[PDB]
Write a protein that binds this ligand. Structure first.
Ligand SMILES: C[S@@+](CC[C@H](N)C(=O)[O-])C[C@H]1O[C@@H](n2cnc3c(N)ncnc32)[C@H](O)[C@@H]1O
Ligand SMILES: C[S@@+](CC[C@H](N)C(=O)[O-])C[C@H]1O[C@@H](n2cnc3c(N)ncnc32)[C@H](O)[C@@H]1O
Lengths: 336, 335
């Protein structure tokens, strides 16, 4: 589509108000209160401890987005709410949305006006490093990121095979959602994770909980300045490229190729747009979101990625969907 | 319609990114640069001082929203962008979105999680009054609001008749973006804008810079504390109820009755939702925005309104649109 109407501009301009309506409602557990059938405003005010008038304002907003129904002054969850926003639901990501997206991503995006001009102010967050140097920000971010990545990680295990005596290197593997999931799926797999000190310290705990402390080690520090383990059987880079400066992209590929045994696989998972630069929409929006605290980010597109991987010397290069409408999986092999 | 799937919820959850893509682009004159025809990423960088890789990211975001087209490594304005987001377009409104909605409203909506639980930090902006203690602040708000209320003000200069010997009382008046457009349409018209000292002073510049400095007055104070000029022919209230605590509503209804000449009309312009609580969307969202810095605000519906009016004494009250899909106009007449 190509917009023609002022209304269509308005819808875009005012989307942030929609997001915050959804987000506020999650913070006060609105959808969970409705899980047992429709409630009135005052029935809602009671269950949530909100004032009847604020709840009315919030629910009216939600209804006008179709997030809930409003029938005879009674509110009820939409099918989407039932599945995605109720604590416990099959596809729940309410906590992901209100913790990381709302409390962190929303505010940070107030920086893009300066970030896209490569003119951040001194007091702004200018990188993951700077950002995660606050241990409360590292946690707020990582807890939701970990829960959110389990699904995709389980999706990933189904695609690739890492059985046998194999070593995995996860550059920027956060708190181990991928490495842990992979290690639970493949018996003889040993993993190494590289990340920032505050992220690694939380990671250690997830790895203990899972009883994998004997199979998953952390190598702490900035991945660009720290040494990686050599002769790995596979290397994973999930949401790394998006949060790193454009000038670093080739060297990461070259380093990766070099730390891989012959026959080894490079796996890159990230927000990637199609080369026609038309979408997917969420990949592009997330790319812009990372630019806000990564002002030297370059947009990844699928054919650049394929090309650079071949330029780097990899083979059997493929790029395709991972999370539908949002991320792609690129896959490459060091010759054997 | 009700949402069912992930895409539809994501669309809501990530709408803020969409909004910011549009805003960033405006601050940097993207669409204005594209007005002379499609441009490569490189050519775009030349015209804006922005770095190529970053224009590419901004432009890709926008193309995926349909705001620009993307063809052969070139970007061009969508017809909507060409019409409404280019500097000097008959219907340009890019600066309003850029300055008020982005620079101010977006930041203020971060207070919403605490505001709907009536629990703002002392740090937070907790009312129009508190907000406008800062002259720097009162200026940037009205700057883009006053110039944005001209439209609605014109559409109301086409509607009612303020002809003859007529006095006006614009309670909660702002920098008089209404009072000004009214008289200027109606040769013989008075004026009496009540408001806040920090904003008054700005509008005095707006009236002086229009030539009306002797018809329009100002009655400094907190409309709820300060007394207004009695016996008027018309008492406007635009966006007032929206940013005032909901317990001042009924009493604002009685008060406004007094200061009119029996036979004089009252006008309420504001965000009002249909009684069934389903929209319009922009009206519902704006009430939520205003609740961010008005934690005591009440949601205005069309029925409650028409209802309480009549209940206060007014007659032949008429509640109807006004800026479709966003605001309504009430209209009553004093016995
Ligand atoms: C978006 S997150 C998600 C982590 C994980 N790979 C996943 O898929 O859930 C990116 C992670 O990479 C880390 N990271 C970013 N840049 C890094 C760098 N230069 N060196 C090491 N770690 C980095 C961040 O700390 C963050 O935890
Ligand atoms: C959303 S604005 C719009 C101004 C103008 N009436 C218009 O139609 O564009 C609300 C105005 O009313 C003022 N205001 C809000 N509450 C007020 C109060 N309790 N007393 C006096 N002025 C108030 C604000 O200063 C602001 O200028």
């Amino acid at each position: 589509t190509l917009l023609t109407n002022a209304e269509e501009i308005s819808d875009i301009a005012f989307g942030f108000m929609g997001s915050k309506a959804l987000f506020a409602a999650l913070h006060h557990g609105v959808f969970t209160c409705l899980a047992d059938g429709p409630l009135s405003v005052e029935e809602m005010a009671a269950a949530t401890g909100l004032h009847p008038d604020r709840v009315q304002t919030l629910l009216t907003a939600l209804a006008s987005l179709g997030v809930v129904s409003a029938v005879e002054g009674r509110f009820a969850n939409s099918p989407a709410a039932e599945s995605f926003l109720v604590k416990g639901a099959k596809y729940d990501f309410g906590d992901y949305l209100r913790l990381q997206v709302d409390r962190q991503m929303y505010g940070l995006l107030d920086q893009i006006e300066d970030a896209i001009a490569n003119n951040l102010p001194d007091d702004a967050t200018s990188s993951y490093a700077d950002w995660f140097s606050d241990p409360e920000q590292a946690k707020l971010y990582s807890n939701s990121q970990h829960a959110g990545s389990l699904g995709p990680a389980r999706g990933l295990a189904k695609l690739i095979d890492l059985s046998g005596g194999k070593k995995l290197l996860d550059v920027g593997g956060g708190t181990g959602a991928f490495a842990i999931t992979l290690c639970k799926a493949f018996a003889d797999l040993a993993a190494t994770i590289v990340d920032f000190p505050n992220v690694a310290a939380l990671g250690k705990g997830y790895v203990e909980k899972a009883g994998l402390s004997d199979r998953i080690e952390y190598v702490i520090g900035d991945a660009l300045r720290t040494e990686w383990p050599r002769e790995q059987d596979a290397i994973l880079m999930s949401y790394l490229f998006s949060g790193v400066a454009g000038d670093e992209h080739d060297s990461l590929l070259k380093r990766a190729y070099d730390h891989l045994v012959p026959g080894g696989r490079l796996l890159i998972h990230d927000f990637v747009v199609t080369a026609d630069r038309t979408g997917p929409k969420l990949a592009a929006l997330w790319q812009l979101q990372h630019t806000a605290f990564t002002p030297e980010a370059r947009s990844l597109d699928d054919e650049w990625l394929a090309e650079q991987l071949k330029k780097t010397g990899f083979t059997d290069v493929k790029v395709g969907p991972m999370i539908p409408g949002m991320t792609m999986l690129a896959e490459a092999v060091r010759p054997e």
